[PDB]
Amino acid sequence: SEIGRTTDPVRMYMREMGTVELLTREGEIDIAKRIEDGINQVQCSVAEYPEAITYLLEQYDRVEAEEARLSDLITGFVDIDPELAREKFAELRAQYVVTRDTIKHATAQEEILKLSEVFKQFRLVPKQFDYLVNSMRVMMDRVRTQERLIMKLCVEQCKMPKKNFITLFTGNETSDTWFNAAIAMNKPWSEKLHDVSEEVHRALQKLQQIEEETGLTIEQVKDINRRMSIGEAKARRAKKEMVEANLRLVISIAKKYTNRGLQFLDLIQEGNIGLMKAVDKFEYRRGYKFSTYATWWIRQAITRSIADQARTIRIPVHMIETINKLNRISRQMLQEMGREPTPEELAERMLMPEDKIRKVLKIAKEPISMETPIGDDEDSHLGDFIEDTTLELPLDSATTESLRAATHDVLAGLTAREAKVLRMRFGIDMNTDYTLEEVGKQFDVTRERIRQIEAKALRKLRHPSRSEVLRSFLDD
Amino acid sequence: SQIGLFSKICRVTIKTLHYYNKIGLLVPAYINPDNGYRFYTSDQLMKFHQIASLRQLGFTITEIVTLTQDENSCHIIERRRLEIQKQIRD
DNA sequence: GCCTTGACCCTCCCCTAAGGGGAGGGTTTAGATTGTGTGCAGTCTGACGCGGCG
RNA sequence: GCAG
DNA sequence: CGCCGCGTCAGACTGCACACAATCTAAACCCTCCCCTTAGGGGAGGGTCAAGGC
Ligand SMILES: [Mg+2]
């Protein structure tokens, strides 16, 4: 189509963004219903893992003795007072204790779905719900890379048929009777394989703890993890359908922030991040349109990024808000008084001390480019008028070397002991100076004798016999 | 009751409640873990009332910790009585 | 002169009780709003190279 | 803006 | 394969003087950490002062 005719990233963004038609009032409701359907689907899948609801039950047991409050674990109930939640946790507890004692296998496979759809009633907070899902995630991910290294324990031995190797591995999972038929195959590969049949043992039996740790076996929670992925990827592509359809809301908001130190695309990217938060935190059951909430989050993200990354030397958000308040107060006083308000009267229009306002006024200036043309000459820039102030003048370098030579003369006009006491007492010809105790430990002498030595040496160097070379280094 | 609402209930500043938590004198009932927000209950106002009642008698903070945690401690209040009598004379 | 030696003495860092004050960081904001606009610059000519394009 |  | 459009690449050298840029928006909560308040105390680290003996 129009592809290839522009390189501007903002034209490309707008062109690619406009291919998504907006949502109606009932479109947002459908998409939010799909999102919550995905998250309750992953809820009802993880309810198949019973240690999850035991964790939530012992969390309520923590709420029993005020380890937490109720608002931290449950945000509501669909089918907020502590009145209902007591019988709610009784409902989940009664289902758990009736599901515990049953071991069978079609007899014990409806009780789990009863558990899941009694647990569906809980509108969990993101904290606990995230905790359970990433917990079961890391559990089967470690045992799953364990299964994957059981497979690639054959690749170190040989290259092997996996399509013949998948028919064996599943379902026994407590023994090597699936591995016993591998030598009934006896193609060359399955020679090498069996010699590592010992170092697979500690792998192939250790998931046998989880075979009784969750109460389930690995193929059941395998399908549970698969339906977990289906549910969360269902919610993820539904949040994406609500983010992509409100990308013009971001632009309508972000055009109001344009020249405040950020490029247009920086603003709409930060607004996009805020919009993704707004989608994550939207409740359609409040009966409000998506624009009313999403505007709050988009405004937050955009103004926060302007506060953070629009200035070269960054000032905090508290000082950003103080500067904004000062500028608004000042443009009101300028309109009233008909002139610029002096910081003294600006200190009574605001209610801050006057030197605080003076330093706030000193803060706000932005650094000048060192390439600004001076007088718009464009052959003379600001940066070539800036001198290096850290250098020392070569007259001062010549003076320092002359002073070193003079000090060497004067200190050679002393005895070795006094010259050593002075060369250690100050840092002369050394990398460090020393205390009286360190110089005394160098001479196995207590500190006051070193002090006396150094005093008499300073007395000698003060004389008119040795000090006319040195006194010339003190400017009169 | 968040710390602002509670600080206005008991009519003392926020930093005072921060301090009373820091020294372990008056601990919030429930601290939200990630934010760190302090939330109090009525049975924290019940203890702050006792704290303020003792603090209007000049009891030093450690003396209040002892007065609230150690019972039958009338020798410390009598000691404080003798010290207050000395400061009234002075 | 060479040393010691106990007695002083200085500066500096941290501490006191019960919070005050501020800096600098987090967080949520629920009527509903859904495509950037400068009243921009555009105004330099000539040589050269390369690539769509008939 | 200017000087050669 | 020859041609037209488009992009890129240049365009004197020293000096003074002058002088930048100028519009452009949140608030109410909470948290931690740091430094401050009296009237000096306590102590490490490091000099200093008369005395005495070698
Ligand atoms: Mg000029």
| Residues in chain B closer than 8 A to A72 (CB atoms) | 32
Cα–Cα distance between A382 and A373 in angstroms, integer?
6
Cα–Cα distance between A41 and A118 in angstroms, integer?
13
CB A153, CB A196: distance < 8 Å: yes
Alpha-carbon torsion (A106, A112, A115, A121), positive or negative: negative
Which residue in A251, A215, A231, A220 sits closest to A15, CA to CA? A251
What are phi and psi for residue A77, nearest 5 degrees?
-145, 130
Cα–Cα distance between A48 and A77 in angstroms, integer?
20
Determine if strand C comes within 7 Å of the CB of B55: yes
Using H for helix, E for strand and C for coil, what is the string for chain A?
CCCCCCCCHHHHHHHHHCCCCCCCHHHHHHHHHHHHHHHHHHHHHHCCCHHHHHHHHHHHHHHHCCCCCHHHCEEEECCCCHHHHHHHHHHHHHHHHHHHCCCCCHHHCCHHHHHHHHHCCEEECHHHHHHHHHHHHHHHHHHHHHHHHHHCCCCCCCCCCCCCCHHHHCCCCCCCHHHHCCCCCCCCHHHHHHCCCCCCHHHHCCHHHHHHHCCCCHHHHHHHHHHHHHHHHHHHHHHHHHHHCCHHHHHHHHHHHCCCCCCHHHHHHHHHHHHHHHHHCCCHHHCCCHHHHHHHHHHHHHHHHHHHHCCCCCCCHHHHHHHHHHHHHHHHHHHHHCCCCCHHHHHHHCCCCHHHHHHHHHHCCCCCCCCCEHHHCCCCEHHHHCCCCCCCCHHHHHHHHHHHHHHHHHHHCCCHHHHHHHHHHCCCCCCCCCCHHHHHHHCCCCHHHHHHHHHHHHHHHCCCCCCCCCHHHCCC
Tell the burial category of A103 from Cβ atoms under 10 Å away from its Cβ (0-12, 13-18, 19+): exposed
Start-to-end CA distance of chain B, whole Å, equals: 44
Tokens representing A43 are 């809820």
DSSP sequence for B9-28: HTT--HHHHHHHHHTTSS--
A66 vs chain B: nearest CA distance in angstroms? 7
CB A197, CB A179: distance < 8 Å: yes
Q: Helix, strand or coil for residue B72? A: coil
User: In sequence order, what are the residues at sequence separation of 6 or more whose Cβ sits closer than 8 angstroms to the Cβ of residue A153?
Assistant: A196, A199, A200, A203
Nucleotide at minimal C1' distance from the B17 CA? C19
A67 vs chain B: nearest CA distance in angstroms? 7
> For residue A134, which amino acid is it?
N
- For B31, which residue in chain A has the nearest alpha carbon? A68
Tokens 């002892």, located at residue: B66
C-beta neighbour count of A255 within 10 angstroms: 11
Nucleotides of C under 7 A from a protein CB: 2-7, 17-21, 23-37
Q: Helix, strand or coil for residue B31? A: strand
User: How long is chain B?
Assistant: 90
C-beta neighbour count of B66 within 10 angstroms: 13
Strand E interface, A 341-380, C-beta < 7 A: 366, 368-369, 372-377, 380
Cα–Cα distance between A63 and B6 in angstroms, integer?
22
CB B47, CB B6: distance < 8 Å: no
A74 vs chain B: nearest CA distance in angstroms? 14
Tokens representing B68 are 């609230």
> For residue A15, which amino acid is it?
R
Cα–Cα distance between A465 and A290 in angstroms, integer?
93
Beta strand A74-77 pairing with B38-39: unpaired
- For A70, which residue in chain B has the nearest alpha carbon? B30
Please write down the long-range contacts of A143-148, taking CB distance under 8 Å and 24 or more positions apart. Answer: A143/A207, A143/A210, A143/A218, A144/A225, A146/A203, A146/A206, A146/A207, A147/A207, A147/A218
Q: What is the largest CA-CA distance in chain B?
A: 53
C-beta neighbour count of A239 within 10 angstroms: 18
Tokens representing B51 are 């704290």
| Residues in chain A closer than 8 A to B32 (CB atoms) | 72
Which residue in A23, A433, A95, A32 sits closest to A235, CA to CA? A32
C-beta neighbour count of B44 within 10 angstroms: 22
- Axis-axis angle for helices A317-337, A354-363 (nearest 10): 110
Cα–Cα distance between A428 and A122 in angstroms, integer?
78
Tokens representing A239 are 């949040």
Tokens representing B8 are 């206005």
A336 vs chain B: nearest CA distance in angstroms? 37
Start-to-end CA distance of chain A, whole Å, equals: 84
Interchain pair B39, A66: CB under 8 A: no
Domains and CATH numbers, chain A: 7-66+80-309 (1.10.601.10), 310-390 (1.10.10.10), 391-472 (1.10.10.10)
Cα–Cα distance between A53 and A49 in angstroms, integer?
8
B65 touches chain A (CB under 8 A): no
Alpha carbon A126 to chain centroid, angstroms: 18
- For B34, which residue in chain A has the nearest alpha carbon? A127
A377 CA from centroid of ligand 1 (Å): 6
CA A300 to C1' E26, in angstroms, rounded, equals: 9
Nucleotide at minimal C1' distance from the A261 CA? E24
CA A373 to C1' C50, in angstroms, rounded, equals: 37
Burial letters A106-115, b for 16+ CB under 10 A, else e: eeeeeebeeb
What are phi and psi for residue A378, nearest 5 degrees?
55, 15
Cα–Cα distance between A202 and A205 in angstroms, integer?
6
User: In sequence order, what are the residues at sequence separation of 6 or more whose Cβ sits closer than 8 angstroms to the Cβ of residue A263?
Assistant: none
Determine if strand E comes within 7 Å of the CB of A64: no
Which residue in A266, A290, A270 sits closest to A280, CA to CA? A290
Cα–Cα distance between A161 and A78 in angstroms, integer?
50
Resolution in A: 2.7
C-beta neighbour count of A171 within 10 angstroms: 10
Interchain pair B29, A68: CB under 8 A: no
Cα–Cα distance between A327 and A347 in angstroms, integer?
13
Determine if strand C comes within 7 Å of the CB of A414: no
> For residue B89, which amino acid is it?
R
| Residues in chain B closer than 8 A to A66 (CB atoms) | 29-30
Q: List the Cα angle A56/A58/A64 in 5-degree steps.
A: 110
Cα–Cα distance between A115 and A48 in angstroms, integer?
8
Tokens representing A372 are 């600004």
Cα–Cα distance between A204 and A182 in angstroms, integer?
15
Q: Which residue is nearest to nucleotide E27 (CA to C1')?
A: A321
Alpha carbon A261 to chain centroid, angstroms: 24
Q: How was this structure determined?
A: cryo-EM
B29 touches chain A (CB under 8 A): yes
DSSP label of B2? B
Tokens representing A165 are 């190797």
